[PDB]
Structure 1
Amino acid sequence: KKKPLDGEYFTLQIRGRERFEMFRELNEALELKDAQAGKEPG
């Protein structure tokens, strides 16, 4: 499965329910760019 041995994984506590969803959203956003970032050019 390509192994999850990418960068070290971490965690962060976020108080607030609505605010939490907001942080997670930014995280998935960067992960999405990384998907097209490692996309071979051409």
Structure 2
Amino acid sequence: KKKPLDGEYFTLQIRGRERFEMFRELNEALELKDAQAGKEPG
């Protein structure tokens, strides 16, 4: 796949397990849009 350079990844400490699940959903949610954003124009 060789891949382009993916956006630099950063780690983040999140207090509260509940908050982590919430942040994960927002994280995965943005990643999902990004996968479709990677769709060619048209």
Segments ≥4 residues shifted beyond 4 Å = none
Identity rate, percent: 100
Segments of 5+ residues of structure 2 without an aligned counterpart are: none
Cα RMSD of the aligned pairs, angstroms, is: 1.7
When normalised by structure 1's length, the TM-score is 0.78
Segments of 5+ residues of structure 1 without an aligned counterpart are: none
What is the total number of aligned residue pairs between the two structures?
Answer: 42
When normalised by structure 2's length, the TM-score is 0.78
